[PDB]
From Swiss-Prot, chain B:
Protein name listed in UniProt: Thoeris anti-defense 1
InterPro entries xrefs: Acb2/Tad1_hairpin
Functional note: Blocks activity of the Thoeris antiviral defense system (ThsA and ThsB). Binds 2 molecules of 2'cADPR (2' cyclic ADP-D-ribose) per dimer, sequestering them from ThsA; sequestration prevents the signal (probably 3'cADPR in vivo rather than 2'cADPR) from activating the Thoeris antiviral defense system.
Subunit (UniProt): Homodimer, the subunits are arranged head-to-tail.
Keyword Nucleotide-binding in record: yes
Pfam families to which the protein is assigned, alphabetical: Acb2_Tad1_hairpin (PF24729)
Record keywords, A-Z: Nucleotide-binding
Superkingdom of source: Bacteria
One Gene Ontology MF term: nucleotide binding
Entry's family note: Belongs to the Tad1 family.
Binding locations of 2'cADPR: 30, 54, 56, 58, 79, 83, 88, 93, 110, 114, 121, 123
Note: Although 2'cADPR has been crystallized with Tad1 (represented here), evidence suggests 3'cADPR is produced by ThsB2 (AC J8CSK2) and 3'cADPR activates ThsA better than 2'cADPR (AC J8G6Z1).
Lineage: Bacteria, Bacillati, Bacillota, Clostridia, Eubacteriales
Annotated domain remarks: Upon ligand binding the C-terminus changes conformation, enclosing the ligand.
């Protein structure tokens, strides 16, 4: 349904990118964006994107008022973790995937570490340092 | 038919994640659902989002287009940097961000290795 700047993310990958990732909206809680669109570099025969998917993040903490519900970052990393685990058990494994997986799991471990630190201080879900 | 992922986080999880469909190319699933642990007043999920991955390499025929893992990590990267520059920063975020960026760098290395071996977009080791 979508026809083909500052908003596009500058990615680590530079060559042969499948998609562009773009931040949607304005800065919100914490100074972060809470909507992104992943869109193909390819057109269909009449100029629509082959891929145009939106990701909406939980906007406004859980114990704070008026919060839009959505995805949280650890969910995305858990998906990527499951896919790399699968590729590693399959026919096209690689050292690079492994290194990436280990780093993804440690990123997830640090995100959980943040969750538990905020539980322990009784600030999880509030607009607090 | 749970198909639910065993996550690193074990407490206060906002959402569950599920693999949808069957194993595909390379032995991986290409569709996932992120689903609330919370319901609205009539039992519907507050969050029900689906992520469909590029299934079957870009150069082969008969491929379903979609997202690739670098996109998800690039989004999480941006978000963490924004949080880091903002009011509610943390060491934990900084460590997670550095690990996310290194994961992204290892993913690029695969891409660049497959470009140099000139197998990118094909079903080869
Ligand atoms: N790695 C981070 N992940 C999320 N949020 C972060 C991080 N680092 C800093 N923040 C900021 O602290 C607040 C409290 O977060 P929290 O208590 O952990 O939140 P949550 O219950 O999981 O909700 C999540 C939503 O909260 C809102 O505020 C957040 C942000 O402003 C945001 O809009 C969220 O998208
Ligand atoms: N970290 C990995 N990321 C992706 N794919 C991986 C990884 N590790 C191993 N694989 C396997 O090698 C094939 C060639 O991948 P590729 O040549 O790099 O890329 P692609 O053209 O972007 O297509 C992408 C689609 O390809 C299909 O096969 C893939 C997998 O079987 C998959 O269903 C993809 O969803």
């Amino acid at each position: 349904h979508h026809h083909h700047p500052m908003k596009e993310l500058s990615t680590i990958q530079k060559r042969e990118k499948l998609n562009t990732v773009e931040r949607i909206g304005s800065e919100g809680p914490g100074g972060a964006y809470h909507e992104y669109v992943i869109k193909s570099n390819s057109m269909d025969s009449q100029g629509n994107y082959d891929v145009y998917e939106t990701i909406k993040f939980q906007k406004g903490a859980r114990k704070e008022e008026k919060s839009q519900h959505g995805v949280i970052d650890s969910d995305l990393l858990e998906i990527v973790r499951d896919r790399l685990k699968s590729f590693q058990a399959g026919p096209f494994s690689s050292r690079e995937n492994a290194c990436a997986l280990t780093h993804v799991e440690e990123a997830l471990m640090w995100m959980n570490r943040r969750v538990e630190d905020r539980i322990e201080r009784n600030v999880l879900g509030t607009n607090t340092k």
